[PDB]
Design a binder for this molecule. Structure first.
Ligand code: U
Length: 364
């Protein structure tokens, strides 16, 4: 009957959250009851989901997390379930969905309460004595986990991407784009950069703004950027002012009409410092939106392979981003080709079936 799903936070505008939601919904369609344990739930509660919001408190997140696992475990001890699936690393998981990269790997780039907590919770999952089954979405991170923990090969299962169908370009894409461009006041010659997804700092909004500001006068004048995410705009409001970008940048809060932004824009810019996968890279691809992304992103290879944009090699060089942005925007035939390529690729590649493959592994 019952499946316990565990994640620290539910909200609709996150990739971890949307993956969780598509997996929970697929399990519910196969006959199972759905219980969710969480620190917060924003937005509607689907019909039939029992959502338990933990009442635990602590000034430090890592300590909040520890009290959360105690609270959750008490409840399961009293009201058991058939399988426990986590979206965050912690003890007590039968299945862990690897929405984060390897923490130990990034920590080596230690007496802290934070570090100790996060490595201990990673180890609880990945230590060879753990029974946790792991659903991988970044192929590249599996050897990093093995390197740090010695995790058994037979415990890892790689899933395809899980892009939702509404991201796919519709038969009326031209009109959706036209209506979006009207609403935002973008002419045929205007160029729109979009930076999409919460966590602007890690996803490199500071680098995107610098590249926009560094453009040649002729392109700079025609170009604007919209960032969309739940983050506090205020640290970026200062950067935007200092680069003189007040009249050509907007930062919006989370929205549920992302496909309109992907159809209406001219380039997705994603110069992330680090990124486990990069859902929005693939969402741009299926919408025929050209991408500019750093090679550090786990899904950047899809952009190279589909020939749907340009991947910036490491090590990161602001000068190299600046030049590559200007070349992509100056090259209109190249953008048209990147666009066609992404749409052709989206029609034959499996970028969709994650939730069914995940549900198969969770359930048999
Ligand atoms: O305002 C927003 C920001 C992101 N998102 C979605 O959240 C996901 C972000 O992916 P990520 O967490 O893997 O970076 C992706 O599917 C976006 O389309 C929204 O739906 N609305």
């Amino acid at each position: 009957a019952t499946l316990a799903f565990i994640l620290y936070k539910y909200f609709p505008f996150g990739g971890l959250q949307r993956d969780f939601m598509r997996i929970a919904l697929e399990c519910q369609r196969r006959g199972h009851d759905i219980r969710v344990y969480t620190l917060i739930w924003e937005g509607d509660v689907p019909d039939g989901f029992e959502v338990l919001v933990a009442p635990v408190r602590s000034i430090f997140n890592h300590r909040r997390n520890e009290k959360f696992t105690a609270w959750v475990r008490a409840d399961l001890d009293r009201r058991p379930v058939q399988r426990v699936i986590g979206f965050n690393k912690m003890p007590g998981l039968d299945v862990y969905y690897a929405a984060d990269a390897c923490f130990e790997e990034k920590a080596q780039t230690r007496q802290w309460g934070r570090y100790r907590h996060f490595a201990g919770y990673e180890r609880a999952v990945f230590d060879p004595a753990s029974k946790t089954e792991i659903l991988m979405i970044s192929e590249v991170q599996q050897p990093l986990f093995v390197k740090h923990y010695g995790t058994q090969a037979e415990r890892f299962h790689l899933l395809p991407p899980g892009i939702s169908q509404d991201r796919r370009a519709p038969a009326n894409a031209a009109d959706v784009r036209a209506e979006f461009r009207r609403e935002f006041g973008l002419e045929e010659d205007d160029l729109l950069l979009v930076q999409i997804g919460s966590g602007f700092k890690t996803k490199g909004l500071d680098r995107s703004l610098k590249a926009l500001s560094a453009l040649p006068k002729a392109l700079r004048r025609r170009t604007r950027l919209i960032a969309i995410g739940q983050d506090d705009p205020k640290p970026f409001l200062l950067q935007i002012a200092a680069l003189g970008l007040n009249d050509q940048v907007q930062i919006l809060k989370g929205r549920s009409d992302i496909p309109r932004f992907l159809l209406g824009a001219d380039l997705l810019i994603h110069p992330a410092y680090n990124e486990n996968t990069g859902t929005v890279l693939l969402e741009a691809l299926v919408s025929g939106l050209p991408v500019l992304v750093t090679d550090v992103c786990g899904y950047a290879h899809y952009i190279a392979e589909a020939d749907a944009g340009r991947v910036l090699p490491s090590p990161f060089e602001q000068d190299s981003l600046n030049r590559l942005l200007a070349e992509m925007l100056e090259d209109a035939p190249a953008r048209a080709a990147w666009s066609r390529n992404g749409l052709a690729y989206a029609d034959h590649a499996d970028l969709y079936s994650m939730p069914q493959r995940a549900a198969d592994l969770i359930l048999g």
